[PDB]
């Protein structure tokens, strides 16, 4: 099954950690990386005197079950990133989100796929479109039509 994973890092110095995260993704059992998007830059959310986010998408071929893949992405987040000191609930320094898992729809305590908000996020959709321009969502919606209808602004490259 092809899973699509979003990577995000809002570290002041992210490119390095992102590359380490990619290595970790490629080390996941019963899996291999098919494609990695370009690295994109998105502005901080809120105060503009904070670091930009580096965003990318990864296509990962895997025979793991969806919750098994989650085990690994969670492990990698714990190993390669951390929560923020004075805000233990905000974005971690490294985010790995399972955006899509084949054509599967999943709604469990641990896992919701497709990612609940991805259709509203250029940071997810644009890198995804670079690596899977012909993608169709489980509900039948075309990635190309979402980007066109919703008239998203493109992201700058990192
Ligand atoms: Cl969907």
Swiss-Prot record:
Catalytic activities: 6-hydroxymethyl-7,8-dihydropterin + ATP = (7,8-dihydropterin-6-yl)methyl diphosphate + AMP + H(+)
Keyword field: ATP-binding, Folate biosynthesis, Kinase, Nucleotide-binding, Transferase
Alphabetical GO biological process terms: folic acid biosynthetic process; tetrahydrofolate biosynthetic process
EC id: 2.7.6.3
Entry-linked InterPro entries: Hppk, Hppk_sf
CDD domains: HPPK
KW Kinase (keyword) present: yes
EC class: transferase
GO molecular function: 2-amino-4-hydroxy-6-hydroxymethyldihydropteridine diphosphokinase activity; ATP binding; kinase activity; magnesium ion binding
Biological pathway: Cofactor biosynthesis; tetrahydrofolate biosynthesis; 2-amino-4-hydroxy-6-hydroxymethyl-7,8-dihydropteridine diphosphate from 7,8-dihydroneopterin triphosphate: step 4/4
Keyword field contains ATP-binding: yes
Entry note: thermal dependence: Thermostable. Retains 75% of its activity after heating 30 minutes at 96 degrees Celsius.
Family named by the database record: Belongs to the HPPK family.
Function in brief: Catalyzes the transfer of pyrophosphate from adenosine triphosphate (ATP) to 6-hydroxymethyl-7,8-dihydropterin, an enzymatic step in folate biosynthesis pathway.
Name used for this protein in its record: 2-amino-4-hydroxy-6-hydroxymethyldihydropteridine pyrophosphokinase
Organism: Escherichia coli (strain K12)
